[PDB]
Design an enzyme around this catalytic site. Structure first.
Site, PDB file in Angstrom:
ATOM      1  N   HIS A  43       4.728  -1.904  10.143  1.00 17.41           N
ATOM      2  CA  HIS A  43       3.950  -2.680   9.180  1.00 17.41           C
ATOM      3  C   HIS A  43       4.540  -4.044   8.939  1.00 17.41           C
ATOM      4  O   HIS A  43       3.885  -4.860   8.293  1.00 17.41           O
ATOM      5  CB  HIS A  43       3.751  -2.014   7.809  1.00 17.41           C
ATOM      6  CG  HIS A  43       4.999  -1.872   6.944  1.00 17.41           C
ATOM      7  ND1 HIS A  43       5.828  -0.832   6.835  1.00 17.41           N
ATOM      8  CD2 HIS A  43       5.463  -2.893   6.139  1.00 17.41           C
ATOM      9  CE1 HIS A  43       6.784  -1.185   6.023  1.00 17.41           C
ATOM     10  NE2 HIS A  43       6.558  -2.408   5.619  1.00 17.41           N
ATOM     11  N   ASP A  99       5.011   4.410  11.725  1.00 12.84           N
ATOM     12  CA  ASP A  99       5.297   3.044  11.371  1.00 12.84           C
ATOM     13  C   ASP A  99       6.682   2.671  11.862  1.00 12.84           C
ATOM     14  O   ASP A  99       7.615   2.589  11.068  1.00 12.84           O
ATOM     15  CB  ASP A  99       5.177   2.986   9.856  1.00 12.84           C
ATOM     16  CG  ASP A  99       5.288   1.608   9.245  1.00 12.84           C
ATOM     17  OD1 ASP A  99       4.305   0.862   9.313  1.00 12.84           O
ATOM     18  OD2 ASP A  99       6.348   1.322   8.689  1.00 12.84           O
ATOM     19  N   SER A 205      11.005  -3.515   3.154  1.00 14.08           N
ATOM     20  CA  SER A 205      10.315  -2.743   4.192  1.00 14.08           C
ATOM     21  C   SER A 205      10.972  -3.101   5.517  1.00 14.08           C
ATOM     22  O   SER A 205      11.496  -4.211   5.686  1.00 14.08           O
ATOM     23  CB  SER A 205       8.888  -3.171   4.209  1.00 14.08           C
ATOM     24  OG  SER A 205       8.451  -3.570   2.894  1.00 14.08           O
TER      25      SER A 205
HETATM   26  C1  LIG Z   1      -0.584   3.114   2.730  1.00 15.31           C
HETATM   27  C2  LIG Z   1      -0.052   2.126   1.691  1.00 15.31           C
HETATM   28  C3  LIG Z   1       0.643   2.608   0.589  1.00 15.31           C
HETATM   29  C4  LIG Z   1       1.102   1.728  -0.384  1.00 15.31           C
HETATM   30  C5  LIG Z   1       0.843   0.365  -0.297  1.00 15.31           C
HETATM   31  S1  LIG Z   1       1.565  -0.760  -1.578  1.00 15.31           S
HETATM   32  O1  LIG Z   1       0.701  -1.966  -1.683  1.00 15.31           O
HETATM   33  O2  LIG Z   1       1.538  -0.045  -2.931  1.00 15.31           O
HETATM   34  N1  LIG Z   1       3.208  -0.955  -1.404  1.00 15.31           N
HETATM   35  C6  LIG Z   1       3.715  -1.745  -0.309  1.00 15.31           C
HETATM   36  C7  LIG Z   1       5.068  -2.380  -0.637  1.00 15.31           C
HETATM   37  C8  LIG Z   1       6.215  -1.391  -0.664  1.00 15.31           C
HETATM   38  C9  LIG Z   1       6.991  -1.192   0.455  1.00 15.31           C
HETATM   39  C10 LIG Z   1       7.991  -0.242   0.441  1.00 15.31           C
HETATM   40  C11 LIG Z   1       8.217   0.532  -0.673  1.00 15.31           C
HETATM   41  C12 LIG Z   1       9.189   1.532  -0.703  1.00 15.31           C
HETATM   42  N2  LIG Z   1       9.669   2.043   0.445  1.00 15.31           N
HETATM   43  N3  LIG Z   1       9.618   1.979  -1.892  1.00 15.31           N
HETATM   44  C13 LIG Z   1       7.424   0.309  -1.787  1.00 15.31           C
HETATM   45  C14 LIG Z   1       6.420  -0.629  -1.784  1.00 15.31           C
HETATM   46  C15 LIG Z   1       3.761  -0.986   1.028  1.00 15.31           C
HETATM   47  O3  LIG Z   1       4.039   0.236   1.127  1.00 15.31           O
HETATM   48  N4  LIG Z   1       3.413  -1.723   2.074  1.00 15.31           N
HETATM   49  C16 LIG Z   1       3.793  -1.394   3.421  1.00 15.31           C
HETATM   50  C17 LIG Z   1       2.522  -1.372   4.191  1.00 15.31           C
HETATM   51  C18 LIG Z   1       1.938  -2.738   4.167  1.00 15.31           C
HETATM   52  C19 LIG Z   1       1.602  -2.948   2.737  1.00 15.31           C
HETATM   53  C20 LIG Z   1       2.895  -3.067   1.991  1.00 15.31           C
HETATM   54  C21 LIG Z   1       0.086  -0.111   0.766  1.00 15.31           C
HETATM   55  C22 LIG Z   1      -0.310   0.772   1.793  1.00 15.31           C
END
Ligand SMILES: Cc1ccc(S(=O)(=O)N[C@@H](Cc2ccc(C(=N)N)cc2)C(=O)N2CCCCC2)cc1
EC number: 3.4.21.5
Lengths: 259, 36
Positions: A43, A99, A205
């Protein structure tokens, strides 16, 4: 890192940083697993909904920082990428299964005190070490809290953050999220009673989840910071790519072939 | 890259090699003897 404390200089020497060529932003953590290759979340590169599609000539990479912000001339090395490897079975339009991407660098990079590879897990290390209640480590430079944005947010560190987080059993992972969890994923984080908190978050990420073996005193990468519904929401868990469940693919691209 | 270990891998210069534990490392080592 939500609930991070500043890193000691040198704590994650495999920590690479992903950066847009112009204009200049941090996009994701990543890890240096060879002098040649960087591992990260798929991602970071192709998420279509959000116009993420990054060409090889749009990113450069930074190895050996400590500061998010200022170019530490003495220690830091900047490489451009020779090629990218997103998985053919990376399912973005449903649940981000698999991913995982790889990045081949055009230079080989020169290890320092401050620039150094993590180990990829083998069978005995996954089987032993991946259990519920064993904590592993998350690093990066992104938000200490959830944000939308204004002209920017506010919540970006000076220094590489650490938090240490328990791996969460599968039933309680499955159950935390509306979303379809695969045998390629796991979740980490503190359960609701559990006193301590902490999480990855936007900016983190791609970064590595590492575990240290008491057998041989070294570090293995078991997850990649894949996703979450918010940054450290009660009841919600942090999702991570099971690197090892995908060791099949990692070596596919690195040796070109070989199963 | 290899599985199992590059001989040098995942052994941090400033700690591993220098006979030194970092600050939040026994949190992990604790999470194992309290697990099994
Ligand atoms: C299926 C999905 C689930 C959650 C989200 S998000 O906008 O809430 N949260 C974001 C940001 C993020 C990233 C990582 C974490 C984490 N590993 N705690 C938390 C939040 C996200 O999962 N991402 C990675 C994928 C691209 C969009 C950004 C979006 C997509």
């Amino acid at each position: 890192i939500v609930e991070g404390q500043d890193a000691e200089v040198g704590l994650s020497p495999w920590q690479v940083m992903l950066f847009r060529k112009s204009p200049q932003e941090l996009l994701c953590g990543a890890s240096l697993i060879s002098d040649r290759w960087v591992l990260t979340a798929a991602h970071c590169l192709l998420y279509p909904p959000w116009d993420k599609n990054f060409t090889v000539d749009d990113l450069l990479v930074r190895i050996g920082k400590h500061s998010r912000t200022r170019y530490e001339r003495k220690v830091e090395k900047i490489s451009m990428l020779d090629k990218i490897y997103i998985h053919p079975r990376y399912n973005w339009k449903e649940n981000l299964d698999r991913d995982i991407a790889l990045l081949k660098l055009k230079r080989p990079i020169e290890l320092s005190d401050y620039i150094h590879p993590v180990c990829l897990p083998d069978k005995q290390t996954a089987a032993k070490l991946l259990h519920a209640g064993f904590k592993g480590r998350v690093t990066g430079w992104g938000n200490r809290r959830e944000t939308w944005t204004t002209s920017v947010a506010e919540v970006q560190p000076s220094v590489l953050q650490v938090v240490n987080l328990p791996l969460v059993e599968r039933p309680v992972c499955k159950a935390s999220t509306r979303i379809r969890i695969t045998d390629n994923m796991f979740c980490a984080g503190y359960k609701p009673g559990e006193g301590k908190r902490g999480d990855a978050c936007e900016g983190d990420s791609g970064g590595p989840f590492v575990m240290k073996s008491p057998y041989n005193n070294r570090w293995y990468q078991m997850g990649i910071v894949s996703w979450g519904e918010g940054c450290d929401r009660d009841g919600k868990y942090g999702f991570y790519t099971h690197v090892f469940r995908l060791k099949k693919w990692i070596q596919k691209v690195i040796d070109r072939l070989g199963s | 890259t290899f599985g199992a270990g590059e001989a040098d891998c995942g052994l941090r210069p400033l700690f591993e090699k220098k006979q030194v534990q970092d600050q939040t490392e026994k949190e992990l080592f604790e999470s194992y003897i309290e697990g099994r």
